[PDB]
Amino acid sequence: SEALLEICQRRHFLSGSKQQLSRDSLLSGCHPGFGPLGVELRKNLAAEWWTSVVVFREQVFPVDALHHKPGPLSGKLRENLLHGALEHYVNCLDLVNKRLPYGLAQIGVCFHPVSIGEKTEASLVWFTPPRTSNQWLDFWLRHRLQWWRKFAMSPSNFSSSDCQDEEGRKGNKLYYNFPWGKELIETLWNLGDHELLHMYPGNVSKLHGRDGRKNVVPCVLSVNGDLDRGMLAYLYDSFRKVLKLHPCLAPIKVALDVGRGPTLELRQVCQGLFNELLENGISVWPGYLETMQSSLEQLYSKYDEMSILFTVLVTETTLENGLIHLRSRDTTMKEMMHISKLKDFLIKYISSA
Amino acid sequence: SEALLEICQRRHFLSGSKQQLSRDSLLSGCHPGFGPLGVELRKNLAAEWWTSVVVFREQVFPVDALHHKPGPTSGKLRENLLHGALEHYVNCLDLVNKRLPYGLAQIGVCFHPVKSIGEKTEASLVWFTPPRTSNQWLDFWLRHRLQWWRKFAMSPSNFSSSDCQDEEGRKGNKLYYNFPWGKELIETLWNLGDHELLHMYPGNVSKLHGRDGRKNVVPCVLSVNGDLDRGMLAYLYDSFQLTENTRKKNLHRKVLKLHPCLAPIKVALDVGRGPTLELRQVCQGLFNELLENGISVWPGYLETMQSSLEQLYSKYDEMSILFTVLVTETTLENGLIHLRSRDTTMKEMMHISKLKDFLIKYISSAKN
Amino acid sequence: GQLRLNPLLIQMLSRGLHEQIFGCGGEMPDEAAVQRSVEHLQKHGLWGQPATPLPDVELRLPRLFGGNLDQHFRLLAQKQSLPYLEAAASLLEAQLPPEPKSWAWAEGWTRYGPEGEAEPVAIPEERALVFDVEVCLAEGTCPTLAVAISPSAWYSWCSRRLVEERYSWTSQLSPADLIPLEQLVVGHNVSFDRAHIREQYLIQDSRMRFLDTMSMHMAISGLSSFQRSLWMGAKSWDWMDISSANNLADVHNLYVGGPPLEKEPRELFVKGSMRDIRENFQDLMQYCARDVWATFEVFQQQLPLFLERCPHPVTLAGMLEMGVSYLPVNQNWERYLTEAQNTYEELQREMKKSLMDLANDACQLLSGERYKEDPWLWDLEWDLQEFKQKQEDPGPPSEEEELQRSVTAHNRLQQLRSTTDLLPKRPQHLPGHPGWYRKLCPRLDDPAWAPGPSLLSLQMRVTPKLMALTWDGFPLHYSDSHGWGYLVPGRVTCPYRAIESLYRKHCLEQTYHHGNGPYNDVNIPGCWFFKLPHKDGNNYNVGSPFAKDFLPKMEDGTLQAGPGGASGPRALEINKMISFWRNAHKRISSQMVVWLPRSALPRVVTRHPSFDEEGHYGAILPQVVTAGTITRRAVEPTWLTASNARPDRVGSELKAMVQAPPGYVLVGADVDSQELWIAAVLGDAHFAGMHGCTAFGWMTLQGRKSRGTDLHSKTAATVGISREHAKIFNYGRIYGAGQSFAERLLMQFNHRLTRQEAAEKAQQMYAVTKGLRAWTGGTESEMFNKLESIAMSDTPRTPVLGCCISRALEPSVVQGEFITSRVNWVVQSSAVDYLHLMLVAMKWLFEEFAIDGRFCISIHDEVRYLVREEDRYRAALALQITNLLTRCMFAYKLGLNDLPQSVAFFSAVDIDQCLRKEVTMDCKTPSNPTGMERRYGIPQGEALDIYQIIELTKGSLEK
DNA sequence: GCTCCTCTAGACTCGACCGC
DNA sequence: GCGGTCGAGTCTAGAGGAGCT
Ligand SMILES: Nc1ccn([C@H]2C[C@H](O)[C@@H](COP(=O)(O)OP(=O)(O)OP(=O)(O)O)O2)c(=O)n1
Ligand SMILES: [Ca+2]
Ligand SMILES: [Ca+2]
């Protein structure tokens, strides 16, 4: 439990002092910040969510909801991404040409008071016609559960449950199984039309839809998933101290290094391979620049704690026959291959998983 | 300029009501919000900035600066993200093993008082250089940033620059853009000394030591803070080509000529008449094919209604749509689909199997 | 009573200097001469004008040996030129053995003693050598082999890159990779042979001087440009038998007259590779030896003749000092090259992008056949090739239904792939785009395909059509039988009405027009096709309106991109902004820079606080020809040209990159209207023997640039033209240009002037300045009379030094021909004598008072010196003293024993760390926008006057 | 007031493939 | 068996120098 947090702190996943970072601050959005590896992991999670939710769908669109709400109600920071999305209902109705159903998705920070607490959340609002509200709710629940279980090493820990609110609206909530207990990471609510009627008192003419030929008032659906809490869950999922993150999420994938001398001769080869890999969108850790070359086993341990898919070693032979050591993090098996075959193999490994 | 904002509202680059949008609101940061196409353009601009700066450099790292600034007897919303980056200097010296120069980068929101609080999305780069090469790194970054802002534009001469000196004697540069009304600041590079780090880290100054070559030294802090919201507004103003508006006396098409690496939606996919089922299946297959290769598509085939082809083409041009694919009935028997291009407005019948490769070649040839 | 004057109220020298230079007593002015000068001044309304006297200078000049200052200069020159003539004479009486049987194959120098015996030596142990060095161009520019002849032996040198075939040598030149040579090194174009000598790049001046047979040839028997053209065309021709070109073979033919020189047709040094040189060693060495012996014979037959035609030793000492030029450069030169090439490529790419964007916007005129109304795109090919085919909400899909839909879409998509069989094997190329656009856009199958019309360039005949170029508001047009040419309206059918509307718009915003001719043979409906004015004459057709000849026309606003966009004029301005680099990048980027190692630098530079252990300092020794014309003025295209950093030129700050090493400072100053004051003083000496007697000389002396009283300002006011145009006008007319030259200048500068108007204005300008016919009743009548009398004399000689005109220009051989060339030569060779006097006096001052400094460069009339940092003020005072003495000598040789104070000292002696024209410029260019003070770290420089110099130096040159 | 040698880049041409 | 295209060859025009490699 504690060892994983220490590793994340040392490997620059969670920036801040050792005492400064606490579990409650992590879960309440009151942590000092994210380390560069944590920032890239969050960006990868955001990219994957954006793909799976907005990219391969023709009804979802991005949302630009500001942080402050300059409302007399003296402005306040936003607590939900839902209100900004609902402010765009009259605007984004024209994009789909008033054709129900349609959605609006956003990734952004929510200023939940605790001390100010900020969590980055990915929220989707689905303007369902009233007839099929529960059906689309189940559809989104199934898709979100499969997406959250896709990258996991054991979807058994990922779970789900039903619940009810004070109003009496059906809803399901997701709960990752953290080692200490079952903690929540996502929640789906089948809100009514009152969230839209309160913001638009009277004149329901502008709020109509085009379900079939009749015009209806869409029943919005709220699906909020805490991306930072998702990062925490996936980091706890991976955890020899090795964090076996999924290839599509890991921040650093390739560890380029040097072996025997001369340094000058191998520096050009390493830099060329580094540029080649970078141009293909594969992250590389520039370990060749390290003047004080540590032991190969120690370097491999550092890369294992850094969630690096493959470590590349360039030695004297590479200058002549182009053979480079390629260690696999998962199975700790060294192998050699031509330096021109590295890019294709890395792309294959990333795409396959 | 009045028509450009109407186009941005109508084509959903800018949100809010027509009376609620003025250039003062856009520049101040109190606009109701950017339309979905504006959000996509801003994402493209931020991705290009990240590719130019953080991806290729072997030392630039990402950093996370919280929106709230706790303490001095309450909190406050952050105004600049530089002070957030300066707090990670000692933290991020371990990554480069106390080697110089090394930098920190971040893209985030900034809150600026105006009695109304405005917001701006600003991409910063705190660049800890040794004091020996401050005037070298500053000029190198000035050239690099000016080149980056100029390469995506239809008129790089508009993205001018200036060299203003600070009151205390520090040297710096301010980028600009020649909007129709005047020049507006979009990026600034201040060659700050070690004063900020010394003030922020009082006591023993052995922590603030970067191994420049073989000699330790307190690094010189360089801040490069660009405004991405005003940057994308400048790109929208540039693509519209207001100066152009004797040859175009009758030729008048309202087009946003955004750079192919910046345009929000790449291609528009349509369909014509029937049969409905087979054409829908073909369109959905092509949609998935293009999407799986990182090409955004506007699903124009889903429209139950139909508009005139010229009006549809004008609508796509105003939205900065690079290509307009039309899968007609004939595609089922020979695989030929009309392909109108935004730049030329000329139809070319290209085989459906060769569309993905041609689109990838066209997009990637513009440094993608 | 230091306030001396002239009978014309011109403030002359102070008594303290006038009694130390010209001696006491002087001469009582002749009342007749004073009366004539006063009457002449009254004729031009320049008598009695108040002039503010300058403060009188008190200074103690050093001892003047001999007296009269002429014997002084002679003694200085003789003391300077003695140890090198004592070696030239040793060479002229040599006993050189026959050529060696077989040239040795070893590194370094090998002494070939009697009977062709090879013996290795460290260095040639002689005080005189005729030199010729061969360098392989394939290997770069490092020297390969060299052959030199001593007074008593033959020598040969072979580099390590010809003896040892190493895997790879370094690409940076160093003194450890050059020829290891009072000494005299004769040769042909010895500047080329000098740049390959090791010791010539050290900062300390080794006392070695170079005699160039090419320079002596140009001094003795030289050819003007027209004479050179006639001589080349042929090979009234009496002068052809006495002159020759600068080729070593032609010079040997002219001076020796023996068998013609053998030039190897293999050309293994110019075209062949290093292996060819390694194989033909025994033949290339013999060829080099034959060239060396030809140079030796030319020198033998040339040295006495040059001394008999240029008797004053000042000329020889100045020529020996002009050979030793030295341009110190540092690591900023490589950065300058890189950031000029990158900024040239970026601007060229931006222009190409603008052209492609303007091409893309042109396709849309096809719709509705709107292109038939475009004045520029109407005549292109717009044909199109026909292609040769040969409900409610259903709800959420179930878990398997979505996969079924995806699979049924993917399989249907892949089923369409089978239709590729019907597709032709060779795909058609853009059948839907217009005809002119298919050529520009590359074929898809091409491996180097780029989006858009990627094959577009300024050279194509469509680029002046896309840009809609207008020449004085007239659209350009191309006809195959007459080249380019604009269309003047008012007279696929062309849209003449559209052209008329465009011209009306242009005239409102800013027959009747006369140009190269209506050319009614080319019938464009309702238009007149006037050709573009070609520089070669109206008998030739311009192939491109973007040629370098049209840049002034682009800048004047005549050739401008048409309206309707902001990409045409932007492309035109980008074209104007990269002309210099486009024309000179090969020259500037190929300069030979030898990076001196730290072991070769003096302790002054290795201990100065401005010295960094990570910087490289070099030396671009200019390959100057110390006598490059008939006027003996140095010629070097890269450096010795009127260049200065401009805000709209890429890489034009090269002269600002000549940065003195840390511890040295480039002291130097520019002469104020040297070639104008020389003509003025000649006229004054000829007319009445006093300064300001002629109105031209009086205007030159008592003239204020700010007040507009000067010559150029009055000329521009009278003719109503730009100041630069008036300056070129005045310099041309002074050099001897006739009225036809003035007419063509007026027609070129202003297109609204006809030939009649240009002739009238030229006649009116020449009838009040030069006078009437020798000449009488004009401002410059006496000066031109003196110049013509000197030119038409039996043996024209420069009045101030006695240097004779070239044999191919004396009036005996050329009877009544090339009068303009000789009258120009008078003034220009007088200026060259001025420069030689300056150099001799400066070297004397630097040697007697031990001022550590050396000659750097003499760009035009500028005179720079790489003086040590501590001796900058002493060097400035020395420059002022040398200018004073030079002007006094110029007046004394013309019979005027006096000198005006206003021209007796430098306006400002620039003291900076670069060769910028003024010490206040920042040299902001498209390549260097930040400025000198930021990109590199060069602060400004002092511009001390004489009074400020005296206070700093205390008035004494002694340390 | 003008020549020449040579180099590259653009436009047009004649004569020969080869797809149908 | 026939007609549309593809590519070396020729003409033309601007580019540099009138040196030495
Ligand atoms: N149109 C010109 C200008 C100058 N020169 C020559 C003669 C001068 O001796 C030398 C330097 O002249 P500059 O033009 O550099 O400076 P000026 O003497 O003309 O002074 P200014 O430029 O201030 O008028 O160049 C020339 O032949 N033709
Ligand atoms: Ca030579
Ligand atoms: Ca001058």
- Concatenated DSSP letters for C236-276? --TGGGT---SSHHHHHHHHT--SPPPPPSS-TTTTS-HHH
Q: Are C148 and C131 in contact (CB under 8 A)?
A: yes
Which residues touch C251 (CB under 8 Å, ≥6 apart)? Answer: C188, C213, C214, C217, C244, C245, C298
Residue that the structure tokens 């990158």 belong to: C342
CA distance to B148, C130, C634, per residue, from C732 (Å): 49, 41, 20
What's C635's DSSP letter? Answer: B
Residue A352 CB-density burial (10 A; 0-12 exposed, 13-18 middle, 19+ buried): exposed
Residue C756: how many CB atoms within 10 A of its CB?
Answer: 9
Q: Decide if B40 is inside a domain.
A: yes
Residue after which a domain boundary falls, among A181, A212, A238: A238
Please indicate, yes or no, whether residues A28 and A171 belong to a single structural domain of this protein.
yes
Query: What are the contacts of C456-461 at 24+ separation with CB within 8 A?
Result: C456/C352, C456/C355, C456/C356, C456/C359, C457/C352, C457/C355, C458/C351, C458/C355, C458/C544, C458/C546, C458/C575, C459/C544, C459/C546
Residue nearest to atom 5 of ligand 1 (CA): C731
The neighbours of chain A, by the rule of 3 or more Cβ pairs under 8 Å, are B, C
Side-chain half-sphere CA neighbours of C3 within 13 A: 5
Query: Is residue C674 within 6 Å of ligand 1 at its C-beta?
Result: yes
Pocket test for ligand 1, best of C727, C745, C833, C859 (most atoms within 8 A of CB): C727
Nearest to A126 by CA among A48, A204, A61, A199: A61
Q: Decide if A149 is inside a domain.
A: yes
Q: Which of C30, C56, C132, C357 is flagged as catalytic?
A: C132
Nearest to C761 by CA among C748, C771, C775, C746: C746
Coil, strand or helix at C575:
helix
What's A128's DSSP letter? Answer: B
Strand E bases contacted by the protein (CB, 7 Å): 5-6, 12-21
Q: Are C436 and C376 in contact (CB under 8 A)?
A: no
The residues facing A125 across adjacent strands are A104, A222
Which strands, in side-by-side order, build the sheet including C942-944? C855-857, C862-868, C664-670, C909-912, C942-944
The residues facing A104 across adjacent strands are A125
- The Cα B316–Cα C769 span in angstroms is 71
Q: Taking CA atoms, what residue in A is nearest to B85? A: A33
Which residues touch B257 (CB under 8 Å, ≥6 apart)? Answer: B154, B239, B240, B241, B320, B342, B343, C357
Counting one residue from A and one from C, how many pairs have CB atoms under 8 Å apart? Answer: 20
The strand pair at B102-113 and B117-129 is best described as: antiparallel
Tokens, residue C246? 């600068």
Cα B197–B200–B206 angle (5° rounding)? Answer: 60
Please compute Rg for chain A using Cα positions. 24
Residue that the structure tokens 């009614």 belong to: C520
Amino acid at site B184: E
Nearest to C834 by CA among C864, C856, C863: C863
Structural biology method used? cryo-EM
Is CATH 3.30.420.390 correct for C94-309? Answer: yes
Please indicate, yes or no, whether residues B294 and B201 belong to a single structural domain of this protein.
no
Q: Is the peptide bond before C83 cis (omega within 30 degrees of 0)?
A: no
Which residues touch B17 (CB under 8 Å, ≥6 apart)? Answer: none
Q: Are B287 and B356 in contact (CB under 8 A)?
A: no
Q: Decide if A28 is inside a domain.
A: yes
Please indicate, yes or no, whether residues A180 and A56 belong to a single structural domain of this protein.
yes
- The Cα C940–Cα C918 span in angstroms is 9
CB-CB neighbors (< 8 A) of A136 in chain C = 395-396
Q: Decide if B247 is inside a domain.
A: no
Residue C403 CB-density burial (10 A; 0-12 exposed, 13-18 middle, 19+ buried): exposed
Coil, strand or helix at B349:
strand
Nearest to B110 by CA among A115, A66, A31: A66
The H-or-E segment that residue C334 falls in is helix C332-360
The percent of chain C in helix, strand and coil, each rounded to the nearest 5, is 45, 10, 45
Taking the stretch 712-751 of protein chain C, residues with Cβ within 7 Å of any atom in nucleic acid chain D are: 738, 740-741, 744
Phi-psi region of A202 (alpha: psi -120 to 50; beta: other; left: phi over 0): left
Domain that holds residue A23: 2-238
Please indicate, yes or no, whether residues A130 and A17 belong to a single structural domain of this protein.
yes
Q: Are C489 and C470 in contact (CB under 8 A)?
A: no
Amino acid at site B311: Q
Residue A38 CB-density burial (10 A; 0-12 exposed, 13-18 middle, 19+ buried): buried
Burial of C814-828, coded b for 16+ CB within 10 Å and e otherwise, reads beeebebbbbbbbbb
Q: Would an 8 Å CB–CB cutoff place A135 in contact with chain C? A: yes
Residue that the structure tokens 């879409």 belong to: C409
Please indicate, yes or no, whether residues B72 and B201 belong to a single structural domain of this protein.
yes
CB-CB neighbors (< 8 A) of C502 in chain B = 246
Distance from CA of A279 to the nearest CA of C (A): 19
Least CB–CB distance from A101: residue in C393, C397, C399: C393
Q: Decide if B295 is inside a domain.
A: yes
- The Cα C475–Cα C503 span in angstroms is 9
Q: Where in chain C is the domain with CATH 3.30.70.370?
A: 593-671+836-953
Please indicate, yes or no, whether residues A292 and A160 belong to a single structural domain of this protein.
no
- The Cα B91–Cα B106 span in angstroms is 15
- The Cα B269–Cα C195 span in angstroms is 68
Nearest to A350 by CA among A281, A285, A299, A263: A281
The full DSSP string for C356-399 is HHHHHTTGGGGGGGGGGG-TTTTTS----PPP-----------H
- The Cα B43–Cα B46 span in angstroms is 5
Q: Where in chain C is the domain with CATH 3.30.420.390?
A: 94-309
- The Cα B118–Cα B229 span in angstroms is 12
Q: Is the CB of C818 under 7 A from strand D?
A: yes
The strand pair at C862-868 and C855-857 is best described as: antiparallel
Please indicate, yes or no, whether residues B198 and B99 belong to a single structural domain of this protein.
yes
Q: Decide if B271 is inside a domain.
A: yes
- Backbone phi and psi for residue A248, each to the nearest 5 degrees, phi listed first: -70, -10
Residue after which a domain boundary falls, among A184, A208, A238: A238
Q: Are B36 and A61 in contact (CB under 8 A)?
A: yes
Please indicate, yes or no, whether residues B343 and B195 belong to a single structural domain of this protein.
no
Residue A204: which CATH number?
A: 3.30.930.10
Burial of C445-466, coded b for 16+ CB within 10 Å and e otherwise, reads eeeeeebbbeebebeeebbbbb
Residue B358: which CATH number?
A: 3.40.50.800
Tokens, residue A46? 């955001």
Nearest to B363 by CA among B311, B316, B293, B302: B293
Please indicate, yes or no, whether residues B271 and B155 belong to a single structural domain of this protein.
no
Distance from CA of A137 to the nearest CA of C (A): 9
- The Cα A334–Cα A300 span in angstroms is 11
Q: Are C73 and C314 in contact (CB under 8 A)?
A: yes
Nucleotide E19 C1' to residue C265 CA (A): 18
Q: Which fold has domain C593-671+836-953?
A: Alpha-Beta Plaits (3.30.70)
Q: Is the dihedral of CA B185, B186, B192, B196 positive or negative?
A: positive
CA distance to B119, B310, C430, C885, per residue, from B348 (Å): 44, 16, 7, 81
Secondary structure of C495-545 in HEC code, one letter for each residue: CHHHHHHHHHHHHHHCCCCCCCCCCCCCCCCCCEEEECCCCCCCCCCCCCC
Count of domains for chain B? 2
- The Cα C664–Cα C648 span in angstroms is 31
Please indicate, yes or no, whether residues A89 and A191 belong to a single structural domain of this protein.
yes
A128, A133, A135, A140: CA torsion to nearest 10: 60
- The Cα B281–Cα B298 span in angstroms is 16
- The Cα C858–Cα C654 span in angstroms is 15
Tokens, residue B338? 């009309």
The strand pair at C143-149 and C154-158 is best described as: antiparallel
Nucleotide E14 C1' to residue C638 CA (A): 22
Nucleotide E19 C1' to residue C192 CA (A): 9
Please indicate, yes or no, whether residues A223 and A264 belong to a single structural domain of this protein.
no
Residue C613 CB-density burial (10 A; 0-12 exposed, 13-18 middle, 19+ buried): exposed
What's B223's DSSP letter? Answer: E
Which ligand 1 atom minimizes the distance to the CA of C674?
A: 9
Crossing angle between the packed helical segments C399-415 and B276-291, to the nearest 10 degrees: 90
Q: Is the CB of C457 under 7 A from strand D?
A: yes
* Alpha-carbon A134 to chain mean position: 27
Tokens, residue C864? 């720079």
Please indicate, yes or no, whether residues B32 and B144 belong to a single structural domain of this protein.
yes
Annotation says C177 is catalytic? no
- Backbone phi and psi for residue B166, each to the nearest 5 degrees, phi listed first: -70, 160
Nearest to C358 by CA among B252, B248, B324, B314: B248
- The Cα A98–Cα A217 span in angstroms is 11
Residue C66: how many CB atoms within 10 A of its CB?
Answer: 12
Nearest to B198 by CA among B131, B153, B136: B131
The residues facing C158 across adjacent strands are C108, C145
| B61 with A36: Cβ contact below 8 A | yes
Q: Decide if B253 is inside a domain.
A: no
Q: Are A126 and A139 in contact (CB under 8 A)?
A: no
Residue that the structure tokens 């401005």 belong to: C610
| B62 with A36: Cβ contact below 8 A | yes
Tokens, residue C420? 């590729």
Q: Decide if B98 is inside a domain.
A: yes
The H-or-E segment that residue C872 falls in is helix C872-893
- The Cα C482–Cα C540 span in angstroms is 8
Nearest to A64 by CA among B31, B112, B115: B31
CA distance to A124, A165, A180, per residue, from A145 (Å): 15, 21, 21
Residue that the structure tokens 């898809």 belong to: C444
The strand pair at B161-162 and B117-129 is best described as: unpaired
Q: Are A151 and A234 in contact (CB under 8 A)?
A: yes
Q: Is the dihedral of CA C464, C469, C475, C481 positive or negative?
A: negative
Residue after which a domain boundary falls, among A204, A238, A272: A238
Q: Are C487 and C462 in contact (CB under 8 A)?
A: no
Residue C327: how many CB atoms within 10 A of its CB?
Answer: 24
Cα C828–C830–C836 angle (5° rounding)? Answer: 110
